[PDB]
Amino acid sequence: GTSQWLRKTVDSAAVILFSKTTCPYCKKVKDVLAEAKIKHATIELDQLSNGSAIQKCLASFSKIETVPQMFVRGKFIGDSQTVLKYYSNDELAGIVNESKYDYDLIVIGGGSGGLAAGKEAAKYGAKTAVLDYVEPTPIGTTWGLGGTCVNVGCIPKKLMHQAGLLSHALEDAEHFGWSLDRSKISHNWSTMVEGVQSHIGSLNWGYKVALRDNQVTYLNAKGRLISPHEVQITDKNQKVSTITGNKIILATGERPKYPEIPGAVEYGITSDDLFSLPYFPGKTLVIGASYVALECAGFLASLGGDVTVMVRSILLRGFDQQMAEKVGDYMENHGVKFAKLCVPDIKQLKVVDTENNKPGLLLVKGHYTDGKKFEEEFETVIFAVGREPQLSKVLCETVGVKLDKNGRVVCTDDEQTTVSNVYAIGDINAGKPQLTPVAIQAGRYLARRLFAGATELTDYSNVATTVFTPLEYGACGLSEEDAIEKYGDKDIEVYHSNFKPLEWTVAHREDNVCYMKLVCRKSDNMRVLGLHVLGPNAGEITQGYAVAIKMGATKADFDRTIGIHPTCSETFTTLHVTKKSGVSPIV
């Protein structure tokens, strides 16, 4: 119990001090360590409810039972007299840098999860390397340190969403008394992209500064795991070499898929290319119906573009389908065209005009599921048909790391792979939600367990989401159809209501488009199984409720909490119309 924890903690910690807050000999050792600039984990036994047992177990390692005790990479170094001995004899620095491997930790992948893991590990004295390389897109697009979210994901996507939201702010301003004329105003794409990219550039720089300031080695090189402890690296001159590490974290993420049709790779683009594109896409086809497809089509339409979305089967597969349909109906009422039940079978009519900064022109041919034909011209074609890893590029098959049928890494609930010193975090961890805050939490918590004796695991259940379509959609927990499948229709009650933002009244916007519902379990005290909201600032609205759902909130907890007025979120505190009653949810 305690003894198995202590043995795991001593074996993998890089530099660790066992201590008590009240001991002057411990304080004496602490003072020497960072005077020598030695980072290390510390465990204060007088703060743990079974530190008495832990203190006894230490003797199995050191032959002594007192504090302080200092260890390095699994070996007892000494008590207070001995550490100080090594200090004044100039032997300490070499003791703490002695290692079987080049690094205590090698992280393959410099994105959301890998940067978080690497920085946290270095805080506790682990000698750490972070490797990052960006394979160019088929047209040559590349970018800096930070991963998919920072460069070609959450950050530029929401900034362009905000640019689209501002179009309605300009419209609304007239009704609130401002003198501008919305009809005489236009949008400049390249001015937007320049501002977005300047912010991304400050993030690239900020990450390189942060790794420097934590004493992390950053290598802009491609990594490949060739045995449990050996990582082969290839740098920008094609020089190949091998570095070794005790623990390995795989954190290499995914890249967009292309469909296997003529012309797709040659003449289309993906989200990887869109966020730094030097010309306005113009008339655009988006192929796909994921949240990436709908978000990109949405802001393009708000920025003045002529936009079509070609949908294989349904919108937002895997999300609540009543909410998916309301999301799409709103988009279709504000500009976006949909080619439903349709797939592509791409021809080039004009080459991209790199000089004058203009798109080319394309003929797209496809068919509907009944066999009728699709044929139309577009200036830009964007594929948003899913994302995949390519771990046969990162991971030799002889190492023994097990993958699933989709090519993701099969892990235990502490992120361990089938190779005992190798872990995986982020989008490549099979079965986990593919989100930046999850990858960050998993990375930081894993670093603390490896190098500071922590025990807390990452909790992957009921993680809230937000889809940033022109009208935003936040959710936490089960869809209504999943809840019914799991418990049966008679054990599920659904409370719901339309609402109108107060900001929308003077602006003459729609009365009954925003919507929210709570999906509850009758036989478990009306437990809230899932929460759904369509409306402005849906992410801000949803976040706080995710804490209450984590704690097991019921309908009664929502009723006894009082609202804040005037807000959209307060509508969750007075819900009363049930779906079974058949009463209308309009307001």
Added chain:
Amino acid sequence: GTSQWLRKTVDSAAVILFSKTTCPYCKKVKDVLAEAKIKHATIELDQLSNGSAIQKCLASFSKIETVPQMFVRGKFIGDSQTVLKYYSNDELAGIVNESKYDYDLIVIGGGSGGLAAGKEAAKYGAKTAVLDYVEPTPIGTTWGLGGTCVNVGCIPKKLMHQAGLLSHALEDAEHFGWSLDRSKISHNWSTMVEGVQSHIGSLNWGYKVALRDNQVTYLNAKGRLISPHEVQITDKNQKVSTITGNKIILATGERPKYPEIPGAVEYGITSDDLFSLPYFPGKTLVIGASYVALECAGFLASLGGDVTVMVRSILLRGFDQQMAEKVGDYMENHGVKFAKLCVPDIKQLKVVDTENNKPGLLLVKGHYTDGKKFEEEFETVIFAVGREPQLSKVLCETVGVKLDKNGRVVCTDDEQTTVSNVYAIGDINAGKPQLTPVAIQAGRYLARRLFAGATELTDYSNVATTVFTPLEYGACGLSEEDAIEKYGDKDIEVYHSNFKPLEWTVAHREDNVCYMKLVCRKSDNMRVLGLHVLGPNAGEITQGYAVAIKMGATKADFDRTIGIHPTCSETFTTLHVTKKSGVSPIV
């Protein structure tokens, strides 16, 4: 136990059926009542924990132990056969309408609490009257049904705040690529007031339709309680008469105070006048430092006004003072001027030009707390120095209703006054938070206890708030200073952090002005005592966390919950810097 609940329910309900969902005899009685358009409460005994105990207890009133049993105003009326007998002989309508009083319920006051109480009561067959009258301001301002929030409070105040927020949307849009020039755009006060007043008028009418469709008698008349059951009314022609009622709900609210100085009533205005003012206020002095004072000064400055606030001592007395200082510092940096530690001693220079729609001109003279003098000219002077009831107008002292030293009604935890059939709700209920959703919950919950046999009480603790200053401030729970005073400094831990909205990056707004903190109790598992956030959309951010705080959230609950990215709210899920540590909170 069960005995005394049943007695209370029978004596108080207007029309109540005791039933079981499975019984076809109950189904037949319900249908008769529905056809005769008789509204009633229903208690389904087969869905209560001790419904079997109630069923035998009903014998004390009816001499029968069976179901259905119908009661009217405390009298047993009959079982299925007997009720059908009265229906067949055309005797039912007179039985259900006969009462010792004109009304089952008279509500004095047609505002947030009063309208909610009256509509809820009528849903269970209580015969209800709602009285409302708006005594004009000193310059003659008056308005329609709905109360302070609807007409001169939360609704018009947040609509003008939105108009002010749009000035920053206009500035921001240039940086996101839109071609307007904020420099050549102006604001028209009267166009704004017209749109706001048109929405308020749709609410006045909506409340009159709602009362009609619930069979509630609405009298636009001044009401005065002269004995426990007698209400004297005065109408628009000064015709005086008396109506009687079984239960009485006092819900008359408050009005703004004026300071006792020359010129104040003659030449100043209050928030009561501001929201329909026919001319732009111009150079404005706001006297006071409550949330009303600051919210009004904030949007006036954003609309292009020259605004000064005169502060007697501190900003936002009663709120967290660190937070209040950050609110005031933001307004000072964005154009509001402050005259600190200063009170007024008002002179007319120009009379309001009612013809060409222009303000007058005033001289304000005052003095600072050390003795220096204040003297300066303003076009409009707005007093926001508090609000008070005047129950001497509403309530004869001989009736016996206890008031406190401030003139508010002293109530038990079920809103009962010292006169057993008289209740008080909303802003006049002493010691309760003076907020619109509180009044609505109190009113709806009380009507159900009186007329449908409900037992749930209103919970007044940890009610969340939002101050809609130009940068908004949301809170739920204790201020930091109140926590320290109640538990001691050694037992309080404070986690805090600055943040920057992603929307502010491309717009080049400030890096370290938004701010958030959690105030926690160490010896109670790091219980979250209070939550505070300064930033955009603060009310949307805070609302959901109020459910978690109601359920007893700890810091570990905030830590194990995952963030939604990119949002402002997610910063709460990863807080780690403590105030004790001395580490900077900047980003």
